Ligand binder design. Structure first.
Ligand SMILES: CC(=O)O[C@H]1C[C@@]2(C)[C@@H](C[C@@H](O)[C@H]3[C@@]4(C)CC[C@@H](O)[C@@H](C)[C@@H]4CC[C@@]32C)/C1=C(\CCC=C(C)C)C(=O)O
Ligand SMILES: CC(=O)O[C@H]1C[C@@]2(C)[C@@H](C[C@@H](O)[C@H]3[C@@]4(C)CC[C@@H](O)[C@@H](C)[C@@H]4CC[C@@]32C)/C1=C(\CCC=C(C)C)C(=O)O
Length: 556
């Protein structure tokens, strides 16, 4: 019996939490109530399997169970595992048509919290999990514990509003970031594969643990991959389990891995795990040999490459990464691929050594591109400020892929612009990994949102073509020369007066949605003419909106 197995390991509470998340991430449309019932019924059934390990169907696999339980409310169900299961995975909506989630006044939240606590918190998980079908579950529990703590304390404060609001904003961001990061994770695994996920894991960990040994890292990677392999496929319980052991393991062998892990291992499970996954890189090992030594100068290169290819590259990657925390994980993989491609042609040549001898020369180009992209992009940002810098990115991208839906273009660009204040404040050493990897995340949203209703084939190419090279791929794109402009419409710019109420941010976002609709209508337009109309539109609002009783001003 598996249900039993997992129950003993996670416990009543957590088992109850994870299972809620799984259902919320599968049938994002069903109401909170029907989820609860199924969660209990399923939990109930679990308690019996603990006693008798052969009762009803305690012998079955998780899926069969969870699958039939939902199939009592949910074509996915007209099949049988594994068929039945994966149908569900393919139907997770990344942009569900759920209603905006507004928050009642502070007083209500606190009463609702104080009265019933469990429900309050289960509601929390239900909402986040149904809107972010890929949210790294184990991690969601961490945010839940943090969420409870937010209220547990703020509600006994004086000015609750003052104490909560902030902590609440801090969680929306951090939780939003967490979700993107993981969506990329899953996307890697599901679209590109374990190997892909593995390489990324190798470089990234190797960067954080310069002192760990290739054989040590490789272990951490083989395990990590499994966690995520698991979490993404919906095996949320096993993911949470395995993830825990992995944390137990990293803490036990601390000395073999990093010296910054101390503070992480001296904390509760949940916080322990979050701490590790976010720890800063360990200091770099003192006297380290030159890469050129074993990977370009040695005459035994091609041989080793032929004996254990994947291992060799893994070593190459590990060795370059560990000593280059100032590069982004994508630049590394990129270099690593350049190396592999070279060995391939060079090894089947007359005098291999002479062929692959000047390989580091070809890295120079790939290494500067990002650096220049970053210097440039920050200089600009530094002069325009965040809002104007986003606008710069909004025009640029819209001209690039005019087909994309204005809403997507607005969010993506806004996000892309956040990189400015998110990274440009760091010294050159930490700027690239900060910047280019953050971009690969944002670009992944765009890729997934698009994937739903693919309209631009230029976006499709860049996205499917190569994971590691997307950011470059998009930067290539200039302006679509086949795009035949849109024709003004009224149904395209509903202006009804409900716009003098909205928050400041809600304004910019409207002033932004406009800017895109403009360019969508006048690509050939110029960055000079552009701001001129944009400025007139701002007056109309300012006008009409505080122009006595006028909903017609909008027409006039
Ligand atoms: C405007 C605002 O402040 O919204 C906040 C406030 C918010 C709607 C929150 C998401 C979720 O907890 C909400 C529920 C329904 C959660 C369950 C119950 O306990 C409610 C009594 C509670 C009230 C509003 C709250 C607390 C917010 C979010 C979501 C961001 C988070 C992530 C991971 C993407 C937000 O900041 O956008
Ligand atoms: C330059 C600037 O900051 O303008 C901002 C500021 C702005 C002129 C605003 C439109 C409108 O509320 C304005 C009125 C007259 C609304 C009625 C009253 O309460 C005034 C006391 C108020 C002051 C200025 C304000 C708040 C802006 C807009 C319009 C954007 C809205 C949408 C839907 C695209 C803008 O960002 O362009």
């Amino acid at each position: 019996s598996e249900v039993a197995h997992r129950f003993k390991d996670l416990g009543e509470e957590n088992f109850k939490a994870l299972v809620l998340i799984a259902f919320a991430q599968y049938l994002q449309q069903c109401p909170f109530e029907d989820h609860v019932k199924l969660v209990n019924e399923v939990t109930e059934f679990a308690k019996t399997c603990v006693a008798d390990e052969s009762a009803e169907n305690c012998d079955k696999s998780l899926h069969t169970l969870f699958g039939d339980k939902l199939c009592t409310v949910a074509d996915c169900c007209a099949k049988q595992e594994p068929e039945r299961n994966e149908c569900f995975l393919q139907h997770k909506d990344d942009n569900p048509n759920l209603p905006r989630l507004v928050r009642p006044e502070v007083d209500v939240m606190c009463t609702a919290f104080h009265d019933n606590e469990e429900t309050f918190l289960k509601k929390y998980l239900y909402e986040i999990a149904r809107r972010h079908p890929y949210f790294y579950a184990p991690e969601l529990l961490f945010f839940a514990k943090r969420y409870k703590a937010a209220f547990t304390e703020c509600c006994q404060a004086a000015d609750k509003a003052a104490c909560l609001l902030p902590k609440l904003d801090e969680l929306r961001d951090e939780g939003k970031a967490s979700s993107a990061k993981q969506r990329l994770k899953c996307a890697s695994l599901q679209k590109f594969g374990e190997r892909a996920f593995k390489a990324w894991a190798v470089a990234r960990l190797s960067q954080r643990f310069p002192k760990a040994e290739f054989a040590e890292v490789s272990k951490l990677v083989t395990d990590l991959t499994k966690v995520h392999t698991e979490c993404c496929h919906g095996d949320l319980l096993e993911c949470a389990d395995d993830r825990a052991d992995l944390a137990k393991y990293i803490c036990e062998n601390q000395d073999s891995i990093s010296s910054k892990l101390k503070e992480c291992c001296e904390k509760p499970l949940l916080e322990k795990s979050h701490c590790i996954a976010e720890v800063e890189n360990d200091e770099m090992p003192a006297d380290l040999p030159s890469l050129a030594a074993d990977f370009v100068e040695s005459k035994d290169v091609c041989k080793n490459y032929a004996e254990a290819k994947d291992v060799f590259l893994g070593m190459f990657l590990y060795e370059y990464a560990r000593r280059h925390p100032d590069y982004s994980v994508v630049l590394l993989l990129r270099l690593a691929k350049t190396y592999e491609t070279t060995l391939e042609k060079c090894c089947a040549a007359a005098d291999p050594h002479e062929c692959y001898a000047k390989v580091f020369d070809e890295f120079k180009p790939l290494v500067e591109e990002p650096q220049n992209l970053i210097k440039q992009n920050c200089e600009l940002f530094e002069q325009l400020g965040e809002y104007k810098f986003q606008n710069a990115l909004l025009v640029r991208y819209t001209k690039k892929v005019p087909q994309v839906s204005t809403p997507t273009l607005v969010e993506v660009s806004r996000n892309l612009g956040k990189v400015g204040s998110k990274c440009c404040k760091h010294p050159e050493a930490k700027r690239m990994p900060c910047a280019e990897d953050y971009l690969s995340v944002v670009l992944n949203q765009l890729c997934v949102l698009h994937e739903k209703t693919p309209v631009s084939d230029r976006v499709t190419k860049c996205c499917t073509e190569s994971l590691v090279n997307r950011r470059p791929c998009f930067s290539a794109l200039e302006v679509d020369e086949t795009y035949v402009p849109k024709e003004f419409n009224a149904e395209t710019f509903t202006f009804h007066a409900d716009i003098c109420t909205l928050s400041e941010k809600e304004r910019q976002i409207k002033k932004q949605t406009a800017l895109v609709e403009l360019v969508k209508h006048k690509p050939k337009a110029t960055k000079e003419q552009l701001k001129a109309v944009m400025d007139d539109f701002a007056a109309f609002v300012e006008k009409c909106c505080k122009a006595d009783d006028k909903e017609t001003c909008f027409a006039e």
